PDB file of all heavy atoms in Angstrom:
ATOM      1  N   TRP A   1      13.576  -0.623 -12.182  1.00 34.01           N
ATOM      2  CA  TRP A   1      12.192  -0.207 -12.393  1.00 34.01           C
ATOM      3  C   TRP A   1      11.313  -1.434 -12.693  1.00 34.01           C
ATOM      4  O   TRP A   1      11.391  -2.003 -13.788  1.00 34.01           O
ATOM      5  CB  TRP A   1      12.136   0.773 -13.563  1.00 34.01           C
ATOM      6  CG  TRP A   1      10.917   1.609 -13.587  1.00 34.01           C
ATOM      7  CD1 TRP A   1       9.685   1.285 -13.082  1.00 34.01           C
ATOM      8  CD2 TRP A   1      10.811   2.937 -14.109  1.00 34.01           C
ATOM      9  NE1 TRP A   1       8.819   2.343 -13.258  1.00 34.01           N
ATOM     10  CE2 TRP A   1       9.478   3.362 -13.897  1.00 34.01           C
ATOM     11  CE3 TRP A   1      11.717   3.813 -14.735  1.00 34.01           C
ATOM     12  CZ2 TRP A   1       9.034   4.628 -14.261  1.00 34.01           C
ATOM     13  CZ3 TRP A   1      11.262   5.069 -15.121  1.00 34.01           C
ATOM     14  CH2 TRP A   1       9.929   5.465 -14.885  1.00 34.01           C
ATOM     15  N   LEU A   2      10.462  -1.849 -11.741  1.00 34.09           N
ATOM     16  CA  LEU A   2       9.559  -2.993 -11.997  1.00 34.09           C
ATOM     17  C   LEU A   2       8.260  -2.511 -12.612  1.00 34.09           C
ATOM     18  O   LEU A   2       7.672  -1.534 -12.144  1.00 34.09           O
ATOM     19  CB  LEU A   2       9.243  -3.755 -10.708  1.00 34.09           C
ATOM     20  CG  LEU A   2      10.442  -4.090  -9.795  1.00 34.09           C
ATOM     21  CD1 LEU A   2       9.982  -4.767  -8.509  1.00 34.09           C
ATOM     22  CD2 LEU A   2      11.454  -4.954 -10.541  1.00 34.09           C
ATOM     23  N   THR A   3       7.764  -3.242 -13.624  1.00 34.14           N
ATOM     24  CA  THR A   3       6.517  -2.861 -14.262  1.00 34.14           C
ATOM     25  C   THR A   3       5.690  -4.125 -14.539  1.00 34.14           C
ATOM     26  O   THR A   3       6.119  -5.250 -14.280  1.00 34.14           O
ATOM     27  CB  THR A   3       6.729  -2.055 -15.565  1.00 34.14           C
ATOM     28  OG1 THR A   3       7.481  -2.814 -16.533  1.00 34.14           O
ATOM     29  CG2 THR A   3       7.390  -0.693 -15.303  1.00 34.14           C
ATOM     30  N   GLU A   4       4.488  -3.906 -15.047  1.00 32.30           N
ATOM     31  CA  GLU A   4       3.577  -5.002 -15.365  1.00 32.30           C
ATOM     32  C   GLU A   4       4.182  -5.911 -16.431  1.00 32.30           C
ATOM     33  O   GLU A   4       4.956  -5.478 -17.284  1.00 32.30           O
ATOM     34  CB  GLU A   4       2.225  -4.458 -15.841  1.00 32.30           C
ATOM     35  CG  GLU A   4       2.261  -3.623 -17.125  1.00 32.30           C
ATOM     36  CD  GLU A   4       2.221  -4.453 -18.402  1.00 32.30           C
ATOM     37  OE1 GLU A   4       1.706  -5.599 -18.370  1.00 32.30           O
ATOM     38  OE2 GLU A   4       2.694  -3.952 -19.444  1.00 32.30           O
ATOM     39  N   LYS A   5       3.800  -7.185 -16.387  1.00 33.72           N
ATOM     40  CA  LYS A   5       4.218  -8.166 -17.379  1.00 33.72           C
ATOM     41  C   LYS A   5       2.961  -8.864 -17.880  1.00 33.72           C
ATOM     42  O   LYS A   5       2.142  -9.307 -17.074  1.00 33.72           O
ATOM     43  CB  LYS A   5       5.197  -9.172 -16.771  1.00 33.72           C
ATOM     44  CG  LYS A   5       5.772 -10.207 -17.724  1.00 33.72           C
ATOM     45  CD  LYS A   5       6.737 -11.120 -16.958  1.00 33.72           C
ATOM     46  CE  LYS A   5       7.625 -11.911 -17.912  1.00 33.72           C
ATOM     47  NZ  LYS A   5       8.237 -13.108 -17.256  1.00 33.72           N
ATOM     48  N   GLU A   6       2.785  -8.923 -19.192  1.00 31.61           N
ATOM     49  CA  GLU A   6       1.593  -9.586 -19.783  1.00 31.61           C
ATOM     50  C   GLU A   6       0.271  -8.999 -19.268  1.00 31.61           C
ATOM     51  O   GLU A   6      -0.728  -9.719 -19.142  1.00 31.61           O
ATOM     52  CB  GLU A   6       1.584 -11.094 -19.517  1.00 31.61           C
ATOM     53  CG  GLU A   6       2.912 -11.749 -19.324  1.00 31.61           C
ATOM     54  CD  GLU A   6       3.463 -12.317 -20.577  1.00 31.61           C
ATOM     55  OE1 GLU A   6       3.051 -11.864 -21.669  1.00 31.61           O
ATOM     56  OE2 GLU A   6       4.290 -13.246 -20.475  1.00 31.61           O
ATOM     57  N   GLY A   7       0.253  -7.706 -18.923  1.00 29.38           N
ATOM     58  CA  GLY A   7      -0.948  -7.026 -18.487  1.00 29.38           C
ATOM     59  C   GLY A   7      -1.224  -7.045 -16.997  1.00 29.38           C
ATOM     60  O   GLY A   7      -2.192  -6.409 -16.557  1.00 29.38           O
ATOM     61  N   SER A   8      -0.416  -7.742 -16.203  1.00 31.35           N
ATOM     62  CA  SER A   8      -0.673  -7.865 -14.782  1.00 31.35           C
ATOM     63  C   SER A   8       0.572  -7.477 -13.976  1.00 31.35           C
ATOM     64  O   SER A   8       1.706  -7.641 -14.416  1.00 31.35           O
ATOM     65  CB  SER A   8      -1.104  -9.273 -14.407  1.00 31.35           C
ATOM     66  OG  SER A   8       0.017 -10.036 -14.023  1.00 31.35           O
ATOM     67  N   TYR A   9       0.326  -7.005 -12.775  1.00 28.88           N
ATOM     68  CA  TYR A   9       1.386  -6.654 -11.831  1.00 28.88           C
ATOM     69  C   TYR A   9       0.920  -7.318 -10.553  1.00 28.88           C
ATOM     70  O   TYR A   9       0.160  -6.721  -9.782  1.00 28.88           O
ATOM     71  CB  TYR A   9       1.528  -5.160 -11.694  1.00 28.88           C
ATOM     72  CG  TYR A   9       2.719  -4.712 -10.828  1.00 28.88           C
ATOM     73  CD1 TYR A   9       3.704  -3.888 -11.361  1.00 28.88           C
ATOM     74  CD2 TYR A   9       2.849  -5.113  -9.498  1.00 28.88           C
ATOM     75  CE1 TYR A   9       4.827  -3.447 -10.579  1.00 28.88           C
ATOM     76  CE2 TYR A   9       3.962  -4.684  -8.712  1.00 28.88           C
ATOM     77  CZ  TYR A   9       4.938  -3.855  -9.267  1.00 28.88           C
ATOM     78  OH  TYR A   9       5.998  -3.431  -8.500  1.00 28.88           O
ATOM     79  N   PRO A  10       1.253  -8.591 -10.355  1.00 28.11           N
ATOM     80  CA  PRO A  10       0.771  -9.280  -9.155  1.00 28.11           C
ATOM     81  C   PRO A  10       1.478  -8.750  -7.912  1.00 28.11           C
ATOM     82  O   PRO A  10       2.572  -8.189  -7.979  1.00 28.11           O
ATOM     83  CB  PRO A  10       1.105 -10.752  -9.416  1.00 28.11           C
ATOM     84  CG  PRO A  10       2.144 -10.734 -10.502  1.00 28.11           C
ATOM     85  CD  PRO A  10       1.874  -9.515 -11.322  1.00 28.11           C
ATOM     86  N   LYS A  11       0.807  -8.906  -6.776  1.00 27.92           N
ATOM     87  CA  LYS A  11       1.387  -8.508  -5.502  1.00 27.92           C
ATOM     88  C   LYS A  11       2.716  -9.224  -5.314  1.00 27.92           C
ATOM     89  O   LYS A  11       2.830 -10.421  -5.575  1.00 27.92           O
ATOM     90  CB  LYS A  11       0.406  -8.854  -4.376  1.00 27.92           C
ATOM     91  CG  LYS A  11       0.751  -8.282  -3.021  1.00 27.92           C
ATOM     92  CD  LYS A  11      -0.125  -8.894  -1.927  1.00 27.92           C
ATOM     93  CE  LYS A  11      -1.473  -8.191  -1.779  1.00 27.92           C
ATOM     94  NZ  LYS A  11      -2.350  -8.267  -2.980  1.00 27.92           N
ATOM     95  N   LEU A  12       3.744  -8.488  -4.905  1.00 29.09           N
ATOM     96  CA  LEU A  12       5.057  -9.079  -4.732  1.00 29.09           C
ATOM     97  C   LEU A  12       5.541  -8.905  -3.297  1.00 29.09           C
ATOM     98  O   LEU A  12       5.184  -7.942  -2.615  1.00 29.09           O
ATOM     99  CB  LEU A  12       6.085  -8.478  -5.704  1.00 29.09           C
ATOM    100  CG  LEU A  12       6.498  -7.009  -5.631  1.00 29.09           C
ATOM    101  CD1 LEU A  12       7.564  -6.737  -4.558  1.00 29.09           C
ATOM    102  CD2 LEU A  12       7.010  -6.563  -7.012  1.00 29.09           C
ATOM    103  N   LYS A  13       6.376  -9.843  -2.858  1.00 31.57           N
ATOM    104  CA  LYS A  13       7.022  -9.794  -1.548  1.00 31.57           C
ATOM    105  C   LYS A  13       8.406 -10.384  -1.728  1.00 31.57           C
ATOM    106  O   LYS A  13       8.536 -11.543  -2.125  1.00 31.57           O
ATOM    107  CB  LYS A  13       6.234 -10.582  -0.499  1.00 31.57           C
ATOM    108  CG  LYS A  13       6.814 -10.480   0.907  1.00 31.57           C
ATOM    109  CD  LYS A  13       6.352 -11.608   1.819  1.00 31.57           C
ATOM    110  CE  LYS A  13       6.326 -11.187   3.294  1.00 31.57           C
ATOM    111  NZ  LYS A  13       5.009 -11.624   3.903  1.00 31.57           N
ATOM    112  N   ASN A  14       9.431  -9.596  -1.468  1.00 29.56           N
ATOM    113  CA  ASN A  14      10.791 -10.085  -1.503  1.00 29.56           C
ATOM    114  C   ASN A  14      11.494  -9.608  -0.243  1.00 29.56           C
ATOM    115  O   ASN A  14      11.167  -8.548   0.295  1.00 29.56           O
ATOM    116  CB  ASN A  14      11.520  -9.589  -2.744  1.00 29.56           C
ATOM    117  CG  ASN A  14      12.214 -10.703  -3.484  1.00 29.56           C
ATOM    118  OD1 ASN A  14      12.782 -11.618  -2.863  1.00 29.56           O
ATOM    119  ND2 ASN A  14      12.155 -10.658  -4.816  1.00 29.56           N
ATOM    120  N   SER A  15      12.455 -10.393   0.226  1.00 29.34           N
ATOM    121  CA  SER A  15      13.152 -10.037   1.446  1.00 29.34           C
ATOM    122  C   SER A  15      14.623 -10.407   1.329  1.00 29.34           C
ATOM    123  O   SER A  15      14.980 -11.355   0.619  1.00 29.34           O
ATOM    124  CB  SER A  15      12.496 -10.719   2.650  1.00 29.34           C
ATOM    125  OG  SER A  15      12.662 -12.101   2.580  1.00 29.34           O
ATOM    126  N   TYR A  16      15.474  -9.630   2.009  1.00 30.72           N
ATOM    127  CA  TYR A  16      16.896  -9.931   2.067  1.00 30.72           C
ATOM    128  C   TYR A  16      17.342  -9.976   3.519  1.00 30.72           C
ATOM    129  O   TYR A  16      17.067  -9.049   4.295  1.00 30.72           O
ATOM    130  CB  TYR A  16      17.738  -8.922   1.266  1.00 30.72           C
ATOM    131  CG  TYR A  16      19.214  -8.958   1.644  1.00 30.72           C
ATOM    132  CD1 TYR A  16      20.086  -9.912   1.113  1.00 30.72           C
ATOM    133  CD2 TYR A  16      19.732  -8.029   2.547  1.00 30.72           C
ATOM    134  CE1 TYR A  16      21.441  -9.937   1.482  1.00 30.72           C
ATOM    135  CE2 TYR A  16      21.074  -8.058   2.921  1.00 30.72           C
ATOM    136  CZ  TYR A  16      21.917  -9.023   2.393  1.00 30.72           C
ATOM    137  OH  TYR A  16      23.259  -9.022   2.773  1.00 30.72           O
ATOM    138  N   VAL A  17      18.032 -11.060   3.873  1.00 33.74           N
ATOM    139  CA  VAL A  17      18.594 -11.257   5.205  1.00 33.74           C
ATOM    140  C   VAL A  17      20.047 -10.808   5.168  1.00 33.74           C
ATOM    141  O   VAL A  17      20.826 -11.290   4.329  1.00 33.74           O
ATOM    142  CB  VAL A  17      18.506 -12.734   5.627  1.00 33.74           C
ATOM    143  CG1 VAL A  17      18.856 -12.871   7.116  1.00 33.74           C
ATOM    144  CG2 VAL A  17      17.139 -13.327   5.299  1.00 33.74           C
ATOM    145  N   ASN A  18      20.437  -9.953   6.111  1.00 32.23           N
ATOM    146  CA  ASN A  18      21.770  -9.344   6.109  1.00 32.23           C
ATOM    147  C   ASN A  18      22.765 -10.281   6.774  1.00 32.23           C
ATOM    148  O   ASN A  18      22.946 -10.260   7.994  1.00 32.23           O
ATOM    149  CB  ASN A  18      21.749  -7.997   6.810  1.00 32.23           C
ATOM    150  CG  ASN A  18      23.151  -7.383   6.919  1.00 32.23           C
ATOM    151  OD1 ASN A  18      24.123  -7.987   6.456  1.00 32.23           O
ATOM    152  ND2 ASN A  18      23.260  -6.176   7.526  1.00 32.23           N
ATOM    153  N   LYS A  19      23.456 -11.083   5.958  1.00 32.05           N
ATOM    154  CA  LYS A  19      24.515 -11.959   6.447  1.00 32.05           C
ATOM    155  C   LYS A  19      25.911 -11.406   6.156  1.00 32.05           C
ATOM    156  O   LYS A  19      26.867 -12.179   6.065  1.00 32.05           O
ATOM    157  CB  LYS A  19      24.372 -13.355   5.848  1.00 32.05           C
ATOM    158  CG  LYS A  19      22.977 -13.918   6.025  1.00 32.05           C
ATOM    159  CD  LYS A  19      22.941 -15.393   5.734  1.00 32.05           C
ATOM    160  CE  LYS A  19      21.509 -15.951   5.712  1.00 32.05           C
ATOM    161  NZ  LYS A  19      21.500 -17.427   5.704  1.00 32.05           N
ATOM    162  N   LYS A  20      26.031 -10.108   5.971  1.00 32.19           N
ATOM    163  CA  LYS A  20      27.327  -9.499   5.683  1.00 32.19           C
ATOM    164  C   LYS A  20      28.144  -9.182   6.933  1.00 32.19           C
ATOM    165  O   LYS A  20      29.311  -8.788   6.807  1.00 32.19           O
ATOM    166  CB  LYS A  20      27.140  -8.194   4.896  1.00 32.19           C
ATOM    167  CG  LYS A  20      26.404  -8.353   3.577  1.00 32.19           C
ATOM    168  CD  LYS A  20      27.303  -9.047   2.591  1.00 32.19           C
ATOM    169  CE  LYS A  20      26.743  -9.041   1.186  1.00 32.19           C
ATOM    170  NZ  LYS A  20      27.868  -9.430   0.296  1.00 32.19           N
ATOM    171  N   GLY A  21      27.567  -9.287   8.124  1.00 32.18           N
ATOM    172  CA  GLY A  21      28.263  -8.874   9.325  1.00 32.18           C
ATOM    173  C   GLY A  21      28.556  -7.395   9.376  1.00 32.18           C
ATOM    174  O   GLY A  21      29.386  -6.957  10.179  1.00 32.18           O
ATOM    175  N   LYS A  22      27.920  -6.613   8.517  1.00 32.10           N
ATOM    176  CA  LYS A  22      28.069  -5.167   8.493  1.00 32.10           C
ATOM    177  C   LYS A  22      26.697  -4.554   8.251  1.00 32.10           C
ATOM    178  O   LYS A  22      25.795  -5.202   7.694  1.00 32.10           O
ATOM    179  CB  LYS A  22      29.032  -4.713   7.391  1.00 32.10           C
ATOM    180  CG  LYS A  22      30.460  -5.069   7.658  1.00 32.10           C
ATOM    181  CD  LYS A  22      31.265  -5.048   6.395  1.00 32.10           C
ATOM    182  CE  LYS A  22      32.694  -5.511   6.669  1.00 32.10           C
ATOM    183  NZ  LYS A  22      33.447  -5.835   5.410  1.00 32.10           N
ATOM    184  N   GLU A  23      26.546  -3.287   8.636  1.00 27.12           N
ATOM    185  CA  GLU A  23      25.347  -2.578   8.203  1.00 27.12           C
ATOM    186  C   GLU A  23      25.281  -2.591   6.688  1.00 27.12           C
ATOM    187  O   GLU A  23      26.300  -2.399   6.014  1.00 27.12           O
ATOM    188  CB  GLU A  23      25.364  -1.121   8.657  1.00 27.12           C
ATOM    189  CG  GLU A  23      25.488  -0.927  10.128  1.00 27.12           C
ATOM    190  CD  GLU A  23      25.966   0.475  10.399  1.00 27.12           C
ATOM    191  OE1 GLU A  23      27.212   0.722  10.369  1.00 27.12           O
ATOM    192  OE2 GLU A  23      25.081   1.337  10.585  1.00 27.12           O
ATOM    193  N   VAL A  24      24.075  -2.761   6.154  1.00 23.51           N
ATOM    194  CA  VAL A  24      23.844  -2.679   4.710  1.00 23.51           C
ATOM    195  C   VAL A  24      22.948  -1.489   4.412  1.00 23.51           C
ATOM    196  O   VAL A  24      21.824  -1.397   4.920  1.00 23.51           O
ATOM    197  CB  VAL A  24      23.241  -3.971   4.152  1.00 23.51           C
ATOM    198  CG1 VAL A  24      22.750  -3.746   2.703  1.00 23.51           C
ATOM    199  CG2 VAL A  24      24.286  -5.072   4.181  1.00 23.51           C
TER     200      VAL A  24
END
C-alpha cells in the first residue's frame, strides 16, 4: 500500500523487465 510521505505523493513511474524466461 503506497501512501503520501511528508504531505506529498509525487507522480511515480516504476517498471520491471521480465528476465525470468517465463511468464510472470
Side-chain angles (χ1 to χ4, degrees):
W1 200 332
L2 313 176
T3 60
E4 62 84 25
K5 183 179 196 199
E6 333 266 22
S8 93
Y9 186 121
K11 190 191 275 63
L12 65 82
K13 184 200 208 133
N14 230 321
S15 67
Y16 163 82
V17 191
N18 176 0
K19 309 194 188 192
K20 302 288 190 166
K22 290 160 184 166
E23 302 161 275
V24 168

